[PDB]
Design a protein around this nucleic acid. Structure first.
Lengths: 110, 101
DNA sequence: AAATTTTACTTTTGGTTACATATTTTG
DNA sequence: AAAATATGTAACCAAAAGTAAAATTTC
């Protein structure tokens, strides 16, 4: 259904998005990687899993399509793209979506 | 049966459509395209598939007979054809019908 | 004639590249 | 300290999709 965060609400069902209840279009590629991030609150997503999730392809350290797509999303979702609040970078792993009053997930192991 | 989206009822058997419960003519070609999308909720249809279910032909890589049917269909079903809600486009895959809800 | 497919042009989209900045290593 | 590695993002441009107008068909 609908997911809110900041001034935005995003309808995973229909790919509609609104800022302060005003429609704002998302391209298909933007919905895809935006959804994957949001579908998985607080879960750090590798570029692998993100490329798998959004486009059904395999990724590589060659490519920057994710990072560019992420950049375009931040400029249209983060108040400041420079210091992002919702679409955060986890260094050396990828990107994460953190809701308000939340911190990204840390994994425990054995 | 009838599938309902927006101010529209498309009866898949009776094979006609109503806007606002008003009779709405469709050519066969447009109906064919419609039922293909409508019968597969949220399942993006490639153009390949799209010609099967609707036109009984396979598709070459660069003819665009489907795209123009979609243009014409939105023109008559979308509140705003410019930003469509029921007949959406999926970039590099095809088109999909996202039902109401 | 009506219906529809293909042309021929326009706009959009998303990737790669190129180079700047940032972080962890000591290659 | 450099050096190797990761990330940001602007800009360029091929492929993609919207569509009006012109062909072609319509068993």
């Amino acid at each position: 259904a609908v997911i809110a965060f900041g001034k935005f609400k995003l309808n995973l069902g229909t790919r509609e998005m609104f800022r302060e209840d005003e429609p704002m279009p998302l391209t298909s590629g933007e919905f895809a990687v935006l959804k994957a991030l949001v579908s998985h609150p607080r879960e750090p997503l590798s570029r692998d899993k993100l490329m798998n999730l959004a486009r059904g392809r395999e990724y590589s350290a060659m490519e920057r399509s994710i990072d560019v797509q992420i950049s375009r999303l931040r400029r249209m979702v983060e108040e400041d793209p420079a210091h992002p609040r919702y679409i955060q970078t986890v260094w050396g792993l990828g990107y994460v979506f953190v809701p308000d009053g939340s911190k990204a997930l840390e994994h425990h192991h054995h």
